[PDB]
Amino acid sequence: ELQEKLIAVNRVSKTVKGGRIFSFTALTVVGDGNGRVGFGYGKAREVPAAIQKAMEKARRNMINVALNNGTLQHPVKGVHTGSRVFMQPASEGTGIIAGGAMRAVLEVAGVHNVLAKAYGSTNPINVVRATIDGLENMNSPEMVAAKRGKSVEEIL
Template structure:
């Protein structure tokens, strides 16, 4: 049989960072320990070992030209630069990863071809993880289960502002389809939202949503309510 260049051989991971060496040696086995101490993740294999059930999804940030003026949404946004050799295209894509249980990450990838751009986005997303606080902050529910967020929170990016509100169980995710992908991967099942600004810019809307999720960890909760909030993976 001939050699197929498309087949990629699996190379044994040799960690280069101190955290990577501890993870491979089995000294660090919990992703919450890494995120609580704010240790930067420089290698994607660290996330793959600590969170084996990670799910990857892509945001539809681009649009293909339609035959009669309409267009179909794509995961790649194409930009071209004019050079002496002709037009040089660049592909941009936005990847989201999560375990559906309080951990979510996002990353952006750019390259001259689609596959390298997609791989870069996934790699960057695995290095940029967030712990999401979940709870039941709706006065209409009060079940105490981590199906929503514990309190309202706001995120901003450029002119876009998004505010997330706790919702009772059964309401679902009252956000756009692309924001639903992120909240589902974060383990949030019910939420209300309100957006202002130029929300047609999906990149700014997604970045504003992640800014809101980051702000969930900036608030301190009283001890009598802290027991009802799940921070990160539910133990």
């Protein structure tokens, strides 16, 4: 049901009296390929435990995306920290034209055709947050019609 993807594993370190203590971090995303997506970030002493913590957090933090037949509704911009991303709907057969971190998010969410570009910092943790922030704020003609007090047909 849920597609899981491991985006990045990093080794971090803190210093103590006896020397350095290493640990690992894991960044993952989960999604149902139909408009739901979440990301999790886990820390542990061993890689497998870090990944399992991340998968566990991701499943509890999914948001909803209003997709339009495997693509976006309109161009969107997302921002988080140094990361600025841009995404655009594309025609069928285009595929996912996106960088590695944006690709994992877009794919587990069910986006099949999209043109994307990451500006600024490409740190994966912040690119994922910016991507999901762009998808979560995307509007559909339904909600645009509702808030404006108009029918969908007068919108399109």
